[PDB]
Each structure stands twice: as structure tokens, then as C-alpha cells.
Amino acid sequence: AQFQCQDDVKPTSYTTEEQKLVDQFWNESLIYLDQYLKALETPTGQCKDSAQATIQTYNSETGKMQTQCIMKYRDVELVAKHLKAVLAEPDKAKACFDPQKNYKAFPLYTPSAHVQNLSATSKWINRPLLTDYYKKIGGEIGAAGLELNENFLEITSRTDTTLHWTKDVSIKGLPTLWSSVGWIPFYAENPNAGSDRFRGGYLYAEVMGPWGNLRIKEIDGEKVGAEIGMTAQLFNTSYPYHYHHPQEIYMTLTKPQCIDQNKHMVMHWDNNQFKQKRSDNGWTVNIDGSKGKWKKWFSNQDPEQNWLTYFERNAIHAFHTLEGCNQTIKNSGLVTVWARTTAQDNNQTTQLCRPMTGAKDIKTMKPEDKAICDLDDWKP
Numbered sequence: 563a564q565f566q567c568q569d570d571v572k573p574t575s576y577t578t579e580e581q582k583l584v585d586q587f588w589n590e591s592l593i594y595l596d597q598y599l600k601a602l603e604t605p606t607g608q609c610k611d612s613a614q615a616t617i618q619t620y621n622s623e624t625g626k627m628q629t630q631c632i633m634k635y636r637d638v639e640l641v642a643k644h645l646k647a648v649l650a651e652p653d654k655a656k657a658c659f660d661p662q663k664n665y666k667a668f669p670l671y672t673p674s675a676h677v678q679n680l681s682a683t684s685k686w687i688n689r690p691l692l693t694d695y696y697k698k699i700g701g702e703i704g705a706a707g708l709e710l711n712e713n714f715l716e717i718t719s720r721t722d723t724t725l726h727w728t729k730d731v732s733i734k735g736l737p738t739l740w741s742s743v744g745w746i747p748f749y750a751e752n753p754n755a756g757s758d759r760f761r762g763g764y765l766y767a768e769v770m771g772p773w774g775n776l777r778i779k780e781i782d783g784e785k786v787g788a789e790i791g792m793t794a795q796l797f798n799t800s801y802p803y804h805y806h807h808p809q810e811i812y813m814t815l816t817k818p819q820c821i822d823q824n825k826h827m828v829m830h831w832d833n834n835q836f837k838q839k840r841s842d843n844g845w846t847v848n849i850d851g852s853k854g855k856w857k858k859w860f861s862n863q864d865p866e867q868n869w870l871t872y873f874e875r876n877a878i879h880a881f882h883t884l885e886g887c888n889q890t891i892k893n894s895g896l897v898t899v900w901a902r903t904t905a906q907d908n909n910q911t912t913q914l915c916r917p918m919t920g921a922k923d924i925k926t927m928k929p930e931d932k933a934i935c936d937l938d939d940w941k942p
């Protein structure tokens with residue numbers, strides 16, 4: 563196959579010892595990608611040819627969860643094809659690999675000096691520390707950021723990888739990958755993103771994709787859609803209702819301490835539990851989960867049974883860690899393998915829904931508060 567790298571991939575020269583730090587990063591990236599591919603293709607549940615993914619947590623017609631074999635989505639098949647191409651010719655793919663040591667597009671971080679010391683690669687890359695970043699921010703957002711990032715290793719290690727992976731893709735098994743990939747406090751500065759604690763308590767990182775360490779534009783002329791990485795969300799937070807054009811895949815790593823520690827919702831935008839009004843080339847979706855009505859909509863996440871979900875375009879979703887033993891645990895959260903399948907078409911923006919009662923209630927958003935989601939049409 564012929565690989566074309568993204569535009570911001572600038573060939574570079576490494577010293578002998580530098581090249582060893584890049585190679586360990588690269589080898590664990592390949593393991594991660596290979597395990598990702600096996601997780602897509604290995605049959606689970608009642609699916610014969612690929613993994614069984616949740617696609618709606620509440621189907622309005624059956625009143626039950628709704629499911630699909632994930633490789634039936636053409637975009638997922640293409641991700642699998644391009645991962646196979648990478649794994650078959652890794653020296654060619656490596657030309658598109660960059661540790662992002664001096665990456666200009668925006669700041670990338672390492673949680674803490676403790677995480678930085680898990681690998682010589684991370685120490686050499688020497689990203690800014692999130693512990694420093696949140697100490698400067700201060701306030702309730704900083705307090706949450708410090709809690710998450712000072713305990714990042716313990717939170718991201720509380721994972722059970724033995725059921726749907728054949729290798730430990732967590733920070734314990736791939737410490738160079740997890741300590742060296744660029745972590746992003748994506749909501750720390752977003753005044754629309756719900757509570758202060760959720761904002762300081764959220765992180766994601768990208769291994770492969772238009773902003774990852776592996777940045778392939780095209781393989782054999784096909785636009786590479788795959789965007790693959792990981793997320794960490796601190797316990798006792800609620801990720802507000804949100805949606806976007808690109809399809810999305812989540813694989814739950816966290817082993818929960820109660821069945822309902824980590825709840826998620828995924829609902830198709832035209833699900834009859836919501837109210838939809840056509841807007842200008844879009845839809846206004848009103849969500850009313852008040853007075854207990856939201857509970858039907860949320861399902862528990864765990865790394866054995868309910869480990870995999872697939873989000874069709876503009877599907878409304880939420881990640882909720884307020885219930886149950888979230889009022890009792892510490893140094894915990896929700897950690898996942900995260901991916902999108904169509905990162906190079908349509909609008910990549912993660913859209914946040916807004917409270918029906920206006921901006922005054924952003925900081926208390928949770929599944930029971932009424933919300934409005936302003937969806938936009940996407941291109942066929």
C-alpha cells in the first residue's frame with residue numbers, strides 16, 4: 563500500500579538514543595492498534611462475524627437496549643481495513659508517526675511528574691504537566707483537575723482487560739503509550755461544558771488520527787477516517803448531553819466498584835423519547851428526563867457485558883458518574899478506549915446541548931435537567 567501522511571508531518575532526524583525512545587512509543591502504538599482491530603473483529607454476544615455493540619441504550623419501541631454487530635457499519639469496516647494496512651506495512655506507516663515533541667497546533671500535556679516517569683520516552687518528550695496547569699487555574703475547576711491528575715495512574719489502572727483483549731492495552735500494559743501520548747484538558751476552558759468538576763475532571767488523548775502521533779491522510783488514495791485514543795473522566799461528575807457528526811466507538815476499560823458507577827446514554831437523534839422540530843437544515847431536539855424519566859435511558863458500563871457502544875451520526879449521548887457508589891468511592895472514574903470512524907469529513911466539532919432554563923443552569927447539568935440540542939444536517 564501507499565501511505566500519504568498528513569500535511570503537518572515533517573520528517574525529522576533522531577540521534578541513536580532518541581530513536582530508541584521513538585521506537586518503544588511506536589511499538590506500543592502498534593500493539594494498541596492491533597488490539598483495537600481484534601476488538602472490532604472478534605465476535606461477541608450473538609454476533610457471528612464481529613463484536614456486538616450497543617447502539618441505543620433505550621429503544622423507544624421495545625423499551626429495551628438495542629444492538630448491532632459493529633462491522634456492519636461501512637465506516638467501521640474501513641477503519642478495520644486501514645488498521646490492517648498499517649499492521650501489514652508498519653515501516654511505511656511509521657513515516658507518518660511523530661511523538662509530537664514540538665507540536666504547534668495546540669498544547670498537549672502529561673498528567674503529572676509521576677506519570678511522566680513511567681517511561682524514558684515521556685520524560686524526553688517533556689510535555690507541560692496538568693498538575694501545574696490546574697494549580698494555576700485554581701477554583702473549583704482546578705480542584706477537580708488536581709484530583710484527577712494527581713491520581714491519574716490509580717484511576718487509569720483500575721481496569722479489567724482480560725475479557726475482550728488478548729493483551730493489556732491499559733496504562734499498566736502499555737506505559738510508554740499512555741505516558742507519552744498527548745493529554746488534552748478539553749473542557750477546562752469551555753464555559754458551556756456543565757459542572758466545574760466535570761470540566762477539571764475530563765481528559766482525552768489521541769494515538770492515531772489527524773491530531774495524534776500517527777497522522778495518515780490517505781492509504782491507497784482512501785481518506786483515513788480512523789481516530790483512535792483514550793478518555794478519562796473523574797468519578798462524581800456528569801458529562802452533559804452532547805452530539806456530533808462523526809460516528810464514535812467507546813470500549814469501557816474501568817472495572818466498576820458498583821454496577822451503576824459508570825452509566826452512559828446513547829440515543830438516536832429521532833428517538834421518540836425526545837421531541838424534535840425541524841430547524842434550518844437541522845433539528846431542534848428537546849430532552850426531558852426530569853422526574854425520574856432519564857433512568858430508562860441510561861445503561862451501566864462494564865468491561866465484560868456492556869463494554870462496547872457505537873454512536874451513529876448525531877446520536878445524543880451522555881456519561882454519568884453521579885449515582886450509587888460514586889458517593890462512596892475515591893480516586894476512581896471512567897476510563898475507555900475511544901475512537902471515531904470519519905474524522906476527515908463533515909463537522910468534527912463536539913456539540914454540547916444547553917439547559918432549557920438558560921445559561922444560569924449550565925453548571926448543574928445532569929440527565930434529569932431539561933436540555934436543548936441544536937443539531938445540524940451532515941453530508942450524504
Ligand SMILES: [Zn+2]
Binds near residue numbers: 805806810873
Ligand atoms: Zn461523542
